[PDB]
Amino acid sequence: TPEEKLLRAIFGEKASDVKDSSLRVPNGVSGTVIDVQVFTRDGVEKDKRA
Amino acid sequence: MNKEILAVVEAVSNEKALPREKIFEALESALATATKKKYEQEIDVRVQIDRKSGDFDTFRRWLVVDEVTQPTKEITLEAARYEDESLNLGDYVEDQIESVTFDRITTQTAKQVIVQKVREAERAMVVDQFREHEGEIITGVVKKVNRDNISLDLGNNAEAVILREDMLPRENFRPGDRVRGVLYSVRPEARGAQLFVTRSKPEMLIELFRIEVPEIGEEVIEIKAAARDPGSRAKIAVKTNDKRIDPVGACVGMRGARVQAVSTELGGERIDIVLWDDNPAQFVINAMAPADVASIVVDEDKHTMDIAVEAGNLAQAIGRNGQNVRLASQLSGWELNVMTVDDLQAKHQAEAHAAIDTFTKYLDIDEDFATVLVEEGFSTLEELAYVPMKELLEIEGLDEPTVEALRERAKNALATIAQAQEESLGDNKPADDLLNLEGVDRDLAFKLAARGVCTLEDLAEQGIDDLADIEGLTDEKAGALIMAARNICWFGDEA
Incomplete structure (x- = not known):
């Protein structure tokens, strides 16, 4: 579509599509987070949180 | 700003409706609004994209006001005496600048702003394609089935809206059906210039009948008038240019070709083939079709007449409910009253007596010879000054004293005709509560x-x-x- 050309040819968002697949919290339960882990092999440079 | 914004600005199928700089700025304003939403403060941001190379610079406005709070939202000078008040207090001119914005997370807001800008550009293109030429005055088709409304498509992806009185009294349209109408009131609207299509006046068939006319558009006869109304009356006529041209046959096309041409979506009523001429007696007699020529009358000062036809065509010559009034109101050039056949008989009973009964004593004559003159010639014993001797003094006998009724007004104008403006001498005098009330002329x-x-x-x-x-x-x-x-x-x- 011309909108995609307008956005990625100017703003630079050349990803350019999107598809949300966020890990949703299971429905109907509260809670709190106590620990987080990051596992990554030596193929991708880890981010600042890692 | 990488020599690629121009290639997107110049689509150029529809993005070139505005100028390249203007089209770029149309989306740049939305991008600046999205960045300001992503920005912490609600400062007015003005981002301009150069048409040459897409240099998306940002010279934000100060949006200064008289308020002494929120300096980012409104700059101040009176409270800023340390700054020496370089400008006035409340100058909303551009007095700020930004550098760049990525907004990767705000890509959804950027896409929404781009969609809004695209809708605005499409509306502007539709406006510049339709409202410049007053919508689209051409036969078209509809693609929307709404309640008491229709969306008619046209050229350059136009879309006009049919008014309430556009369709006929019983006309209905559905998805795929076509309801033709005249659209001249083209007003701006969001996402497409929705014009106002309405076929309820004589213009719905004034020019449509000339397409099939054999002499109106063939440089052989002129168009006098054509009165189209919804349901009540619809008469189309072409004036013959003194060349024995058909005044009704041409209006009907080819033995009725144009009779049903304007009866489809121009109001629903069938356009009768009336005749138009230049003769004083043929102005309305031939225009009262379908009927017979039975009225020959014309006024002196104004363009007035009287309708008097056969008993079998009372609702077809003039019509009590306006069934043919439009046939004699515009395509005739004279004004007539719709009535029965008594208009040719009783019209000479009171007109000849009103001007003769009152003057029974103002003429210095008896009542024996006063009504005799009126009976011999009705409407003759009144206003004997403007008319010459050929029509007012052609009677024999007392020819010399016949100018008495005209010479009585030479100096006695306040003797007999003084009762038309002296009704407030002893009673019904003006007051200070209703006669001199303010609010009228x-x-x-x-x-x-x-x-x-x-x-x-x-x-x-x-x-x-x-x-x-x-x-x-x-x-x-x-x-x-x-x-x-x-x-x-x-x-x-x-x-």
Whole structure:
């Protein structure tokens, strides 16, 4: 579509599509987070949180 | 700003409706709004994209106001005396600048802003393609089935909206059906210039009948008038240019080709083939089709006439409910009253007597020879000065004394004709409550001088439309004087 050309040819968002697949919290339960882990092999440079 | 924004600005199928700089700025404003939403403060941001290379610079505005709070939202100079007040207090001119914005997370907001900008650009293109030429005055088709409305498509992806009175009284449209109409009131609208299509006037068939006309558009006959109305009357006529051209056959096309041409979506009513001419007697007799020529009358000063036809075509010659009034109101050039055949018989009973009964004593003559002149010639014993001797003094006998009725007004103009303006000598005099009431023109004293009411207190209990049937004022203008008189006395503490 011309909108995609307008956005990625100017703003630079050349990803350019999107598809949300966020890990949703299971429905109907509260809670709190106590620990987080990051596992990554030596193929991708880890981010600042890692 | 990488020599690629121009390639997107110049699509150029539809993105070139505005200028390249203008089209770029149309999306740059939305991008600046998205960045400001992503920005912490609600400062006015003005981002301009250069058309040459897409240099998306940002020279934000200060949006300064008289407020002494939120300096980012509104700059100040009076409280900024340390800055020496370089400008006035409340200068909303561009006095800020930004550098760049990525907004990767805000890509959804950027896409929404781009969609809004695209909708605005499409609306602007539709406006510049339709409203410049007054929508689209051409036969088209509809693609929407709505309630008392229709969306008619046209060229350059136009979309006009049909008014309430566009379709006929029983006309209906569905998805795929076509309801033709004249669209001339093209007004701006969001996401497409929705024009106003309405076929309820004579213009719905004024020019449509000339397409199939054999002499109107063939440089052989001129178009006098054509009156199209919804359901009541519809008469199409072409004036013959003194060349024995068909005044009704051409209007009907080819033996009725144009009769049903304007009866489809121009109002639903069938356009009768009336005739148009230039003769004083053929102006309306031939225009009263379908009927017979039976009315020959014309006024002296104004373009007035009288309708008098056979008993079998009372509703077809003129019509009591306007069935053929439009056939004699516009395509005739004269004004006539729709009535029965008595218009040719009873019209000479009171007209000849009104001007003769009152003058039974103003002519210095007896009543024995006063009515004899009127009986010999009706409408002859009145205004014997303007007319010459060929039409006013052609009678024998007392030819010399026949100019008495005209010479009586030489110096006695305030003797016999003085009763038309001296009705407020002893009674019905003007008052200061209704005759001189403010809210109307100088002719507002007639309702008080011809009714006999001394004061407005006798009608102060009335509402608004108490005298709506009178000819001295409108429906709601009759009670204005009473309301003013009541208000001048209810709270008249201050003088």
